[PDB]
Amino acid sequence: HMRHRTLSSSPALWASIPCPRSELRLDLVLASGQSFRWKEQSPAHWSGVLADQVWTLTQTEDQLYCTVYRGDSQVSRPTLEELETLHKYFQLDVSLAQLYSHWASVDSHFQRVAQKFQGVRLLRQDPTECLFSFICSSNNNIARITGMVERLCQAFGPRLIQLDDVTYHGFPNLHALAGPEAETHLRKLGLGYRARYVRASAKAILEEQGGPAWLQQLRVAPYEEAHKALCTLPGVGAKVADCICLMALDKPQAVPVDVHVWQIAHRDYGWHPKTSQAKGPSPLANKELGNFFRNLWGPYAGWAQAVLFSADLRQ
């Protein structure tokens, strides 16, 4: 039936937001493992869902070209409010050129690495989508998580539209994931142990915290409160909590610490746990390392990390 648009195919329906490739590189941000809902359907054309709507995105050296598919009606070009949404998603208020410059000034390693990887910024994700996406992320790779999240949305989330062979679903609400046959069905979809944590966390957020409004509270709450709050949930530890804080709760200073960042810290910064003596990853050593990077980079430490992370997936 209807198909995925290119910029050439249907130039009428595309709109644009003025955005240099130095401020945002789609190819580095949408497959960076922040969101797992974007695919490059046709070369340099990124399609994925936002809320209850599909988008396809592509860019030039100075422009971010984008179009919407409402799903239900007259196919038209992105409205103003629809583009405000997109602007916010990419947190484009924030100057990346300034942040790169600031980091480079205090970190000679960053200076050498950031050159080849410009336009790495953080998305502002829906808390719910982010939470459950990052529960599926423990002991896993981007490819597998992408899969799990797609199957999860297909099975539990509302159908929106079909383009080509791909049927786009919205992200499920908590109630949908909280039900009795939720784990069983999720286990069928190959999440394994993670199925328990999904259901449990959905059931928890409803009953223990009073629904999705809780997550919005954490967005306005201070970092430290939000992190402690998140860590109460089944399947959510310091790492996942920091991912969510950073990517969906507007805490730029949150620095998710796993064994991979340990490696980079030790190899590239010569870091060892100083207050600690135990020589390997630990609750306290990880937090120590988080504080280390905040001290060095400042209150957008998580964003700086995102640059290094994106420079590591490319060899």
Ligand SMILES: Clc1ccc(Nc2ccncc2)cc1Cl
């Ligand atoms: Cl800054 C950042 C961005 C994206 C991710 N995504 C992940 C990719 C693979 N396994 C776990 C998480 C993680 C960080 Cl720490």
Ligand code: NI
């Ligand atoms: Ni050493």
